[PDB]
Amino acid sequence: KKGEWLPGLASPGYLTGSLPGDNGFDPLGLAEDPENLKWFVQAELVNGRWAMLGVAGMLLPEVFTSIGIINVPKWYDAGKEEYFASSSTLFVIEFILFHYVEIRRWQDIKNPGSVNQDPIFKQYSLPAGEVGYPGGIFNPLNFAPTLEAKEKEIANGRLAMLAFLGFIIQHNVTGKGPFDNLLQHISDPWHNTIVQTL
């Protein structure tokens, strides 16, 4: 009993249960190969983490704007705004920095523990952790990376990924932002539904 995504269906054999957030969910069998499972675990972590930050940066500035405390552009209109640098320059900065960071993380995915030390400063290295959970400077508050804690990270990532999937599709058909959709729905849910929007 590790949690059943479908109470009737049995859990696949290759999903042992030693992984956080395991509920026996893989109908299409994409992670039958343990190497595919190992790669997709990192893909879920990074996609979930980016979705968590994205959903926060999309929802929280907008609700604070609609309340009246701040006046921050909406997440879809924040790109058209004017900034201190050309958007093209911002792109190149982000590309170069991620072309360094993501490949350093990728070297750990292929070969674990191969990029734990700073190449500039020979000292100040990372302690030995697990793939997807780098210790050292990446955990300053020295929290305990354990079950539940890792299970809550994956659970919040899954809900945030569904939240991002909701935000983009809503904004496409509704025209406005997520918090404006919630206010429109809260005013009259029986007459302000996806049924009424289409």
Partner 1 sequence: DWMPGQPRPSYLDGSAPGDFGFDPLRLGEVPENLERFKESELIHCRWAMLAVPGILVPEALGLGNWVKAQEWAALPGGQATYLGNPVPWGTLPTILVIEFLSIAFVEHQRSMEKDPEKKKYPGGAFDPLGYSKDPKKFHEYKIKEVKNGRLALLAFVGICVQQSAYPGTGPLENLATHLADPWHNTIGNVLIP
Partner 2 sequence: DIAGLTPCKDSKQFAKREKQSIKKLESSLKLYAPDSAPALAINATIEKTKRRFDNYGKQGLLCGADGLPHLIVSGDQRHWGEFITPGILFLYIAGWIGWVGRSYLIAIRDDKKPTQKEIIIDVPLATGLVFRGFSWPIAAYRELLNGELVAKDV
Ligand X SMILES: CCCCCCCCCCCCCCCCCC(=O)OC[C@H](CO[C@@H]1O[C@H](CO[C@H]2O[C@H](CO)[C@H](O)[C@H](O)[C@H]2O)[C@H](O)[C@H](O)[C@H]1O)OC(=O)CCCCCCCCCCCCCCCCC
Ligand Y SMILES: CC(/C=C/C=C(C)/C=C/[C@@]12O[C@]1(C)C[C@@H](O)CC2(C)C)=C\C=C\C=C(C)\C=C\C=C(C)\C=C\[C@@]12O[C@]1(C)C[C@@H](O)CC2(C)C
What does 35 interact with, of partner 1, partner 2, ligand CLA, none (CB < 5 to 8 A by kind)?
partner 2
**CB-CB contact of 18 with 127 (8 Å):** no
Q: Which is nearer to partner 2, 110 or 122 (CB)?
A: 110
What does 73 interact with, of ligand CLA, ligand X, partner 1, none (CB < 5 to 8 A by kind)?
ligand CLA
Report d(CA 119, CA 70) in Å as an integer. 42
What does 80 interact with, of ligand Y, ligand CHL, partner 1, none (CB < 5 to 8 A by kind)?
ligand CHL
Over the chain, what HEC string results?
A: CCCCCCCCCCCCCCCCCCCCCCCCCCCCCCCCCHHHHHHHHHHHHHHHHHHHHHHHHHHHHHHHHHHCCCCCCCCCCCCCCCCCCCHHHHHHHHHHHHHHHHHHHHHHHHCCCCCCCCCCCCCCCCCCCECCECCHHHCCCCCCCCCCHHHHHHHHHHHHHHHHHHHHHHHHHHCCCHHHHHHHHHHCHHHCCHHHHC
What does 27 interact with, of ligand CHL, ligand CLA, partner 2, none (CB < 5 to 8 A by kind)?
partner 2
CB atoms within 10 A of CB 163: 19
Q: Does 101 bind ligand CLA (CB under 6 A)?
A: no
Q: Which is nearer to partner 2, 27 or 112 (CB)?
A: 27
Q: Smallest distance from the beta carbon of 61 to partner 2, in angstroms?
A: 32
Q: Smallest distance from the beta carbon of 101 to ligand CHL, in angstroms?
A: 14
Q: Does 64 bind partner 2 (CB under 8 A)?
A: no
For ligand CHL, how many residues bind (rule: CB under 6 A)?
8
**152 appears as a binding residue in the annotation:** yes
Q: Does 60 bind partner 1 (CB under 8 A)?
A: no
Contacts to partner 2 by CB under 8 A: 27-30, 33, 35-36, 39
Binding positions for chlorophyll a:
25, 44, 152-153, 156, 158, 170, 185
